[PDB]
Design an enzyme around this catalytic site. Structure first.
Site, PDB file in Angstrom:
ATOM      1  N   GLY A   1     -38.617  51.421 110.941  1.00 50.92           N
ATOM      2  CA  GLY A   1     -38.260  50.268 110.133  1.00 50.92           C
ATOM      3  C   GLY A   1     -39.381  49.249 110.017  1.00 50.92           C
TER       4      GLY A   1
ATOM      5  CD  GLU B   1     -39.934  44.646 113.874  1.00 49.46           C
ATOM      6  OE1 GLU B   1     -40.596  44.521 114.927  1.00 49.46           O
ATOM      7  OE2 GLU B   1     -39.247  45.660 113.634  1.00 49.46           O
TER       8      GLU B   1
HETATM    9  C1  4T2 Z   1     -34.716  49.037 113.426  1.00 47.99           C
HETATM   10  C2  4T2 Z   1     -35.535  48.467 114.590  1.00 47.99           C
HETATM   11  C3  4T2 Z   1     -36.047  47.069 114.235  1.00 47.99           C
HETATM   12  C4  4T2 Z   1     -34.621  48.354 115.812  1.00 47.99           C
HETATM   13  O1  4T2 Z   1     -36.620  49.354 114.934  1.00 47.99           O
HETATM   14  C5  4T2 Z   1     -37.744  49.397 114.152  1.00 47.99           C
HETATM   15  O2  4T2 Z   1     -37.692  49.252 112.933  1.00 47.99           O
HETATM   16  N1  4T2 Z   1     -38.928  49.650 114.721  1.00 47.99           N
HETATM   17  C6  4T2 Z   1     -39.061  49.854 116.169  1.00 47.99           C
HETATM   18  C7  4T2 Z   1     -39.278  48.506 116.851  1.00 47.99           C
HETATM   19  O3  4T2 Z   1     -39.002  48.348 118.037  1.00 47.99           O
HETATM   20  N2  4T2 Z   1     -39.739  47.537 116.047  1.00 47.99           N
HETATM   21  O4  4T2 Z   1     -39.949  46.247 116.638  1.00 47.99           O
HETATM   22  C8  4T2 Z   1     -40.111  50.735 116.405  1.00 47.99           C
HETATM   23  C9  4T2 Z   1     -39.835  51.965 116.988  1.00 47.99           C
HETATM   24  C10 4T2 Z   1     -40.857  52.873 117.225  1.00 47.99           C
HETATM   25  C11 4T2 Z   1     -42.160  52.548 116.874  1.00 47.99           C
HETATM   26  C12 4T2 Z   1     -43.167  53.475 117.108  1.00 47.99           C
HETATM   27  C13 4T2 Z   1     -43.308  54.068 118.357  1.00 47.99           C
HETATM   28  C14 4T2 Z   1     -44.313  55.003 118.575  1.00 47.99           C
HETATM   29  C15 4T2 Z   1     -45.170  55.347 117.538  1.00 47.99           C
HETATM   30  C16 4T2 Z   1     -45.019  54.759 116.287  1.00 47.99           C
HETATM   31  C17 4T2 Z   1     -45.872  55.103 115.249  1.00 47.99           C
HETATM   32  N3  4T2 Z   1     -47.178  55.126 115.496  1.00 47.99           N
HETATM   33  N4  4T2 Z   1     -45.334  55.396 114.058  1.00 47.99           N
HETATM   34  O5  4T2 Z   1     -46.250  55.766 112.977  1.00 47.99           O
HETATM   35  C18 4T2 Z   1     -44.017  53.825 116.069  1.00 47.99           C
HETATM   36  C19 4T2 Z   1     -42.444  51.322 116.279  1.00 47.99           C
HETATM   37  C20 4T2 Z   1     -41.417  50.412 116.044  1.00 47.99           C
HETATM   38 ZN    ZN Z   2     -38.624  46.319 118.519  1.00 44.96          ZN
END
Ligand code: 4T2
Ligand code: ZN
Length: 889
Positions: free
Chosen positions: A265, A302
């Protein structure tokens, strides 16, 4: 395959104090020059200097401006740069290097890559090592000085962390930008963006220090009109952290940037949050209703990271849930406050008890703080995130709002600016617990088991009432099934929010009470209970457990109608459904096994159907809540309660139950569908992008749920409604018209109509793809092939791939076709995807997570495809590790 254990954490033998980057972007290559101002730590034992560095092309590396020679001074195996200790300085020194990378061909979307015409980075968790050499771990805190240069007409906007301290022209139509970020940070929070970005802007003034904060939201020029809601959400987010937690933003500027290609996300890079376009961009003409809750959640999430993750960061990756579970929790508080609808909380309980409960009983089961990992790119799970959030939420339930805010502030004030562990948070919560219970002897040592123990606890009940004594008893028992993580499971600290409902008038009999279950079992006694109550248990879903209420359907119906807690009502309805589902299931199963020529099915409880009608016809009742009660529990929730599940039998069971209820309530359904139209499809604010009505959207949800029920039932002349529905301005409506028309001969007519409406908006087309993918069509396999040939093709956009295949995998009757062709199809997609994006490939493995829960035939079919995937010579470490654990190898 290297295995990292949590017990083996040791500080580095080196320090990185300053990072000075020069990132020069060209069409065929990106040149990265980096100087690391380093030192020797007190834990140094004269070891080799080992840097992380993946896929880097070395031009030159140096120590103190002296060129290093490959061979006897250093070795590089495309994963680690080793500098032999003999040539490593004994005090403060400067390491420098120049590498060539290649974002234009980086399709894995990790490190530095090109999303359409935008250069963008993603460094969490181990992506920075793909950009330049570094000791890529979160406890290596450093200062950052970053210069970015690129072709000016292709990349006029340049962004990185911190303050932009210089802009300058470069011979050859190029330009540069320098960003200095003095505060220390881990490298996974580094980010850089370059492109022809357009923006919306605003100024936010903080509540207490009156600091002016500039807010920018970016996108490509074509979709700049879809930025308004995102900016509003950001404002809402900043205010909430100010109002609830008393926390203001500490930087002068915050940028939000949308890109088309993103694995998740979004990402919380300091002052430079980067978003999947589908989680930042929306307009009422080109987005379904769900986008608005989605953007609110993700933008909020975020932002909240700025404290819980960015200012208070992680010592190591095993503490991931400390920033993720806590930030999701903070986001839930935010969204519940913003939407003011009970379905917000219900939706995340619904997701937890389906997806996360499935994971927790699967071979992939792990605690929210795992003891080990191989691939960090498999670490970010629904367990860590969503169970983590529930564990963080239980602190609030236990402490109450006042003492929770106290405890949270203790956590922030004490750990601001440094790394932290899960114990640090529990400690802060414990301090508040001491103050609440008014004795410094009280502690939360047992609560720590929520971090270390895997599996879902079962909580069961027995009741006594003494009419003469006016004395009521609730006997509670808890149990967690042994798994591969703990042979012996310990009793947890389980907070049970309870009410006692007088069945005669529906009134509360006791004040708000939270039972604290700390033993394997306990008996809670209540005096002066005038009449035999009906217990309202786990209000708000106060603990992430299997609730076994042992209530009669009559008692549950009474709660459904008269209880004050939204979850308990919803859960009572759920429990009534499950009992019916389980009964009809092995009635159908027995008939199949015994090959019966005739047999009987137990009808749906008539009083239950009456209660549903009662609630549906109540004008004061919540529209969102209404949509839940007419919907059977999720398939992935039901599977948790059935051994060797025959998906065909379950499909027949659901069909019978839906038909039973429909045969009695279809007229009520149709009446409501028509009467809801005016308020649900109100166009008054259709061109006001900052006006979002979550109640109105819930009304549309109800209408589209009812329309679906009526269409499947072939309700008289319902096709007329479907046709009119397709002419609605709201995408939620005219996409619904497509899916519900699957039961009619006008399906492909609406297929073409809605495609023409969707094709010129990248995100809308993906929603169209989802709608087609989940269409209840007998010829769905032929339709998928059509999508592949005419729309999807060889797109490497994760949004496109996920849109085409994931909804289809939830087609109970078709994806689980006994031939196994559904399993064969997705496995082909996984292998194909794994060659350029291993992370998305494992995401596409989700259907297989329940493989050992199905009937013996489908188990073997799934296991065959997984073994076929495992035997691919070019399989990634990412996918291999995942499938190995899933198949218990
Ligand atoms: C929906 C929510 C906000 C809960 O999660 C996310 O949209 N992103 C999460 C996060 O915690 N954002 O703050 C998230 C999850 C995994 C990762 C992640 C982990 C490991 C590798 C990668 C990556 N390099 N992707 O291309 C990305 C990044 C952000
Ligand atoms: Zn997060």
């Amino acid at each position: 395959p290297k295995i990292h254990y949590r017990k083996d954490y040791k500080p580095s033998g080196f320090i990185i104090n300053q990072v000075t980057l020069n990132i020069n972007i060209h069409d065929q290559e990106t040149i990265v020059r980096s100087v690391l101002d380093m030192d020797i730590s007190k834990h140094n034992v004269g070891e080799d200097l080992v840097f992380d560095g993946v896929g880097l092309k070395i031009n030159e590396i140096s120590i103190n401006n002296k060129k290093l020679v490959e061979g006897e001074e250093y070795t590089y195996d495309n994963e680690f740069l080793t500098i032999f200790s003999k040539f490593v300085p004994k005090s403060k020194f400067a390491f420098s290097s120049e590498v060539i990378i290649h974002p234009e061909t980086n399709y894995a979307l990790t490190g530095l890559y090109k999303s359409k015409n935008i250069i963008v980075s993603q460094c969490e968790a181990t992506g920075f090592r793909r950009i330049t050499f570094f000791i890529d771990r979160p406890d290596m805190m450093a200062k950052y000085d970053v210069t970015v240069t690129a072709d000016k007409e292709k990349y006029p906007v340049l962004l990185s962390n911190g303050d932009k301290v210089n802009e300058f022209e470069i011979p050859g139509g190029r330009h540069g930008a320098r960003f200095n970020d003095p505060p220390l940070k881990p490298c996974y929070l580094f980010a850089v963006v370059a492109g022809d970005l357009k923006h919306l802007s605003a100024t936010y003034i903080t509540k207490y220090t009156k600091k002016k904060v500039e807010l920018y939201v970016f996108s490509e020029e074509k979709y700049v009109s879809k930025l308004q809601w995102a900016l509003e959400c950001l404002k809402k987010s900043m205010a909430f952290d100010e109002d609830y937690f008393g926390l203001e933003y500490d930087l002068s500027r915050l940028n939000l940037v949308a890109v088309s290609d993103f694995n998740v996300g979004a990402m919380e890079n300091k002052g430079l949050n980067i978003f999947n376009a589908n989680s930042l961009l929306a307009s009422k003409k080109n987005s379904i209703d769900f986008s608005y809750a989605r953007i609110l959640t993700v933008v909020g999430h975020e932002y909240f990271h700025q404290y819980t993750g960015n200012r208070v960061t992680l010592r190591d990756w095993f503490q991931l849930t400390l920033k993720e579970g806590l930030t999701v929790h903070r986001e839930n508080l935010f969204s519940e406050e913003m939407t003011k609808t009970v379905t917000t909380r219900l939706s995340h309980v619904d997701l937890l008890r389906s997806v996360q409960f499935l994971e927790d009983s699967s071979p992939l089961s792990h605690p929210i703080r795992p003891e080990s990992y191989v691939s960090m790119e498999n670490f970010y799970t629904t367990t860590v995130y969503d169970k983590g959030s529930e564990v963080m939420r239980m602190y609030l339930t236990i402490l109450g709002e006042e003492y929770y805010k106290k405890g949270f502030d203790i956590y922030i004030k004490k750990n601001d600016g440094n790394t932290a562990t899960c114990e640090d948070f529990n400690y802060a919560m414990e301090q508040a617990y001491k103050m609440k219970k008014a004795d410094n002897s009280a502690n939360l040592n047992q609560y720590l088991l929520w971090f270390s123990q895997s599996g879902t606890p079962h909580v069961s009940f027995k009741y006594n009432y003494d009419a003469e004594k006016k004395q009521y008893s609730i006997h509670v028992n808890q149990y967690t099934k042994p798994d591969e993580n703990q042979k012996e499971k310990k009793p947890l600290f389980i907070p049970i929010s309870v009410g006692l409902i007088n069945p005669e008038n529906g009134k509360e009999m006791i004040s708000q009470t939270t039972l604290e279950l700390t033993k394997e079992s306990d008996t809670f006694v209540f005096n002066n209970i005038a009449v035999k109550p009906i217990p309202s248990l786990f209000r708000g879903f106060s603990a992430p457990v299997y609730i076994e209420d042992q209530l009669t359907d009559e008692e549950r119906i009474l709660l459904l109608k008269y209880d004050s807690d939204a979850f308990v009502r919803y859960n009572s309805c759920t429990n009534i459904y499950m009992k019916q589902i389980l009964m009809n299931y092995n009635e159908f199963l027995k008939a199949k096994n015994e090959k019966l020529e005739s047999f009987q099915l137990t009808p749906v409880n008539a009083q239950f159907i009456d209660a549903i009608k009662y609630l549906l016809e109540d004008p004061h009742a919540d529209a969102g809540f209404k949509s839940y009660i007419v919907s059977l529990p999720q398939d992935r929730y039901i599977i948790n309660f059935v051994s060797n599940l025959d998906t065909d039998v379950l499909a027949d069971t659901k069909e019978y139950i839906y038909k039973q209820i429909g045969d009695k309530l279809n007229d009520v359904y149709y009446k409501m569908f028509k009467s809801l139209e005016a308020k649900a499809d109100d166009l008054t604010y259709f061109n006001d992008e900052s006006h979002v009505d979550f109640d109105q959207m819930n009304m549309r949800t109800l209408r589209n749920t009812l329309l679906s029920l009526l269409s499947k039932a072939q309700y008289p002349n319902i096709l007329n409604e479907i046709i009119e529905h397709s002419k609605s301005p709201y995408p939620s409506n005219w996409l619904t018209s497509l899916s519900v028309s699957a039961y009619f001969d006008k399906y492909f007519e609406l297929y073409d109509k809605t495609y023409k409406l969707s094709k010129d908006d990248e995100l809308l087309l993906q929603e169209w793809l989802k709608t087609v993918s989940r269409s209840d069509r007998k010829d769905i396999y032929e339709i998928l092939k059509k999508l592949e040939n005419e729309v999807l093709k060889d797109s490497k956009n994760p949004n496109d791939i996920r849109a085409v295949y994931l909804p289809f995998t939830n087609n109970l009757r078709r994806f689980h076709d006994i031939s196994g062709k559904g399993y064969k199809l997705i496995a082909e997609v996984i292998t194909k995807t794994d060659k350029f994006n291993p992370m998305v490939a494992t995401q596409l493995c989700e259907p297989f997570k329940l493989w050992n829960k199905l009937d013996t035939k489908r188990q073997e079919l799934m296991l065959n495809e997984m073994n076929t995937m495992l035997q691919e010579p070019q399989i990634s470490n990412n996918l291999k590790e995942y499938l190995l654990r899933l198949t218990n190898k």
